[PDB]
Amino acid sequence: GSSGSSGMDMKRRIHLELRNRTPAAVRELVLDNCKSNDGKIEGLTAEFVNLEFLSLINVGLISVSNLPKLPKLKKLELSENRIFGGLDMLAEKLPNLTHLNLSGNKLKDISTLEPLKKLECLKSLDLFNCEVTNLNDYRESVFKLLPQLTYLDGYDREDQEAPDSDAE
């Protein structure tokens, strides 16, 4: 056996976290830098019924469609990926999602964030280095779209930075 790397597959990186417990025993799961099946998820399963945190950063993903239902997942990190929209699949899979980090994505329009209106629980969002952040008054154009949202790019609805002791 050997440690995970930027050449390891997502199903194989999921196996490296499952070496010690069942997927139903996992609260916090990290799958960063692993390889996807051409921008679709390969190994993730609905047995993660107790998962509250998921990280899939710099895996280079393009589509959220292969996500399982995760009824406890409050926090998802999908940064440094190739995703360009389709976030209505997050609204059905993750019905009480509070934190959604989408930095470095191919998000180009406020209309890519439109299906996040469904998630009445969504409290924090990140869009650092996204094309949608080049728009005129973009930060207000996200908050007017998603009136339930409290944080955008680590700052709040009042344009003040998040606390170090909380914001989790």
Tab-separated table of C-alpha atoms in Angstrom:
chain	number	residue	atom	x	y	z
A	1	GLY	CA	0.000	0.000	0.000
A	2	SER	CA	0.952	3.693	-0.555
A	3	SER	CA	-0.225	7.284	0.239
A	4	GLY	CA	-2.530	9.388	-2.017
A	5	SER	CA	-1.225	11.822	-4.707
A	6	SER	CA	-2.287	14.088	-7.640
A	7	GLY	CA	-2.253	10.847	-9.772
A	8	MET	CA	-4.637	8.895	-7.423
A	9	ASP	CA	-8.304	8.332	-8.472
A	10	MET	CA	-11.266	9.649	-6.381
A	11	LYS	CA	-12.532	6.063	-5.633
A	12	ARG	CA	-8.969	5.188	-4.501
A	13	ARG	CA	-8.656	8.349	-2.313
A	14	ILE	CA	-12.080	7.526	-0.752
A	15	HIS	CA	-10.644	4.021	-0.027
A	16	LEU	CA	-7.677	5.603	1.856
A	17	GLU	CA	-10.156	7.317	4.300
A	18	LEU	CA	-12.233	4.061	4.622
A	19	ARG	CA	-9.136	1.920	5.652
A	20	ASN	CA	-10.166	2.489	9.328
A	21	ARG	CA	-14.033	2.979	9.369
A	22	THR	CA	-17.285	2.497	7.354
A	23	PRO	CA	-18.440	5.501	5.166
A	24	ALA	CA	-21.460	5.736	7.555
A	25	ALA	CA	-19.001	6.440	10.461
A	26	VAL	CA	-17.328	9.461	8.699
A	27	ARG	CA	-18.118	13.078	9.782
A	28	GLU	CA	-15.351	14.881	7.818
A	29	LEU	CA	-14.022	13.717	4.379
A	30	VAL	CA	-11.150	15.234	2.298
A	31	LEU	CA	-10.561	14.143	-1.339
A	32	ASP	CA	-8.425	17.121	-2.558
A	33	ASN	CA	-6.075	16.842	-5.633
A	34	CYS	CA	-7.461	13.349	-6.619
A	35	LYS	CA	-8.479	12.544	-10.239
A	36	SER	CA	-12.129	12.505	-11.364
A	37	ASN	CA	-13.736	10.445	-14.181
A	38	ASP	CA	-13.553	13.258	-16.823
A	39	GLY	CA	-15.060	15.838	-14.377
A	40	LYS	CA	-17.669	13.410	-12.922
A	41	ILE	CA	-17.459	11.857	-9.402
A	42	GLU	CA	-16.387	8.157	-9.491
A	43	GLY	CA	-16.510	6.640	-5.925
A	44	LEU	CA	-18.749	8.806	-3.657
A	45	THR	CA	-21.802	6.992	-2.155
A	46	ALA	CA	-25.075	7.607	-0.235
A	47	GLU	CA	-23.594	5.490	2.633
A	48	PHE	CA	-22.021	8.867	3.787
A	49	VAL	CA	-25.355	9.553	5.717
A	50	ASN	CA	-23.416	11.042	8.712
A	51	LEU	CA	-21.041	13.286	6.679
A	52	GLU	CA	-21.155	16.997	7.715
A	53	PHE	CA	-18.023	18.121	5.744
A	54	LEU	CA	-16.777	17.262	2.203
A	55	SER	CA	-13.675	18.678	0.397
A	56	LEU	CA	-13.110	18.171	-3.371
A	57	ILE	CA	-10.606	21.030	-4.086
A	58	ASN	CA	-8.267	21.072	-7.171
A	59	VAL	CA	-9.656	17.690	-8.378
A	60	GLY	CA	-10.560	19.573	-11.613
A	61	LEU	CA	-14.272	18.514	-11.571
A	62	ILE	CA	-16.732	19.829	-14.237
A	63	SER	CA	-20.127	18.398	-13.055
A	64	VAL	CA	-21.916	17.939	-9.675
A	65	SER	CA	-24.393	15.358	-11.180
A	66	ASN	CA	-22.688	12.237	-9.682
A	67	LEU	CA	-23.078	13.517	-6.052
A	68	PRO	CA	-25.070	11.150	-3.742
A	69	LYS	CA	-27.797	12.428	-1.346
A	70	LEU	CA	-26.039	13.691	1.841
A	71	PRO	CA	-28.804	14.767	4.301
A	72	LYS	CA	-26.324	15.936	7.050
A	73	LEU	CA	-23.782	17.809	4.850
A	74	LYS	CA	-23.743	21.473	5.977
A	75	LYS	CA	-20.364	22.241	4.274
A	76	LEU	CA	-19.031	21.548	0.751
A	77	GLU	CA	-15.716	22.762	-0.734
A	78	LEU	CA	-15.527	22.551	-4.585
A	79	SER	CA	-12.792	25.164	-5.246
A	80	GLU	CA	-10.115	25.191	-8.036
A	81	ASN	CA	-12.458	23.084	-10.287
A	82	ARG	CA	-13.851	23.592	-13.889
A	83	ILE	CA	-17.594	23.761	-12.887
A	84	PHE	CA	-19.602	26.327	-14.964
A	85	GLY	CA	-23.177	25.923	-13.529
A	86	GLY	CA	-25.811	23.218	-12.771
A	87	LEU	CA	-25.969	24.028	-8.998
A	88	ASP	CA	-29.677	22.870	-8.874
A	89	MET	CA	-28.218	19.377	-8.231
A	90	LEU	CA	-26.702	20.748	-4.946
A	91	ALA	CA	-30.196	22.016	-3.940
A	92	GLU	CA	-31.737	18.451	-4.166
A	93	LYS	CA	-28.709	16.383	-2.898
A	94	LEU	CA	-27.725	18.684	0.025
A	95	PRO	CA	-31.118	20.132	1.267
A	96	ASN	CA	-29.638	21.835	4.431
A	97	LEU	CA	-26.240	22.979	3.010
A	98	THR	CA	-24.967	26.140	4.842
A	99	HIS	CA	-21.450	26.570	3.381
A	100	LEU	CA	-20.552	26.294	-0.334
A	101	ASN	CA	-17.014	27.209	-1.495
A	102	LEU	CA	-16.830	27.676	-5.309
A	103	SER	CA	-13.544	29.660	-5.843
A	104	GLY	CA	-11.531	29.235	-9.115
A	105	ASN	CA	-14.642	27.729	-10.848
A	106	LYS	CA	-15.868	28.689	-14.404
A	107	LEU	CA	-18.880	30.529	-12.873
A	108	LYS	CA	-19.365	33.536	-15.246
A	109	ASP	CA	-22.911	34.841	-14.508
A	110	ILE	CA	-25.244	35.599	-11.544
A	111	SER	CA	-27.695	33.150	-13.273
A	112	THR	CA	-25.263	30.257	-12.367
A	113	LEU	CA	-26.103	31.004	-8.682
A	114	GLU	CA	-29.905	31.165	-9.322
A	115	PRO	CA	-30.709	27.544	-8.213
A	116	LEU	CA	-29.001	28.259	-4.819
A	117	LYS	CA	-32.273	30.218	-4.047
A	118	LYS	CA	-33.820	26.758	-3.237
A	119	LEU	CA	-31.458	26.276	-0.228
A	120	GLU	CA	-33.086	28.254	2.602
A	121	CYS	CA	-30.099	27.146	4.806
A	122	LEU	CA	-27.249	28.623	2.655
A	123	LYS	CA	-25.280	31.028	4.930
A	124	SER	CA	-21.765	31.298	3.341
A	125	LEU	CA	-20.445	31.313	-0.277
A	126	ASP	CA	-16.973	31.803	-1.903
A	127	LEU	CA	-16.419	32.810	-5.590
A	128	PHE	CA	-12.760	34.077	-5.509
A	129	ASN	CA	-11.211	34.335	-9.045
A	130	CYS	CA	-14.563	33.426	-10.791
A	131	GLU	CA	-15.593	35.306	-14.006
A	132	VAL	CA	-18.915	36.251	-12.286
A	133	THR	CA	-16.769	38.481	-9.951
A	134	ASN	CA	-15.790	40.702	-12.956
A	135	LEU	CA	-19.444	41.903	-13.318
A	136	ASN	CA	-20.646	45.414	-12.356
A	137	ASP	CA	-21.765	45.513	-8.645
A	138	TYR	CA	-21.502	41.647	-8.632
A	139	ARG	CA	-21.423	41.256	-4.780
A	140	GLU	CA	-24.817	43.005	-4.395
A	141	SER	CA	-26.107	41.034	-7.461
A	142	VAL	CA	-25.442	37.761	-5.514
A	143	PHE	CA	-27.050	38.989	-2.230
A	144	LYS	CA	-30.167	40.384	-4.046
A	145	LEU	CA	-30.489	36.970	-5.778
A	146	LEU	CA	-29.943	34.956	-2.527
A	147	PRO	CA	-31.573	37.033	0.318
A	148	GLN	CA	-30.912	34.167	2.839
A	149	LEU	CA	-27.077	34.411	2.306
A	150	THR	CA	-24.987	36.064	5.113
A	151	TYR	CA	-21.379	35.719	3.764
A	152	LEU	CA	-19.759	36.222	0.330
A	153	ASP	CA	-15.939	36.021	-0.212
A	154	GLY	CA	-15.218	35.842	3.591
A	155	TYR	CA	-17.063	39.199	4.154
A	156	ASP	CA	-20.715	39.705	5.302
A	157	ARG	CA	-23.875	41.600	4.083
A	158	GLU	CA	-22.401	44.766	5.770
A	159	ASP	CA	-18.993	44.383	3.942
A	160	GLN	CA	-17.154	43.344	7.179
A	161	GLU	CA	-14.789	40.308	7.499
A	162	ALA	CA	-15.851	37.027	9.197
A	163	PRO	CA	-14.765	36.138	12.801
A	164	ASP	CA	-11.726	33.884	13.499
A	165	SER	CA	-13.441	32.052	16.446
A	166	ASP	CA	-16.675	30.981	14.593
A	167	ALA	CA	-18.021	31.192	10.940
A	168	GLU	CA	-17.879	27.298	10.782
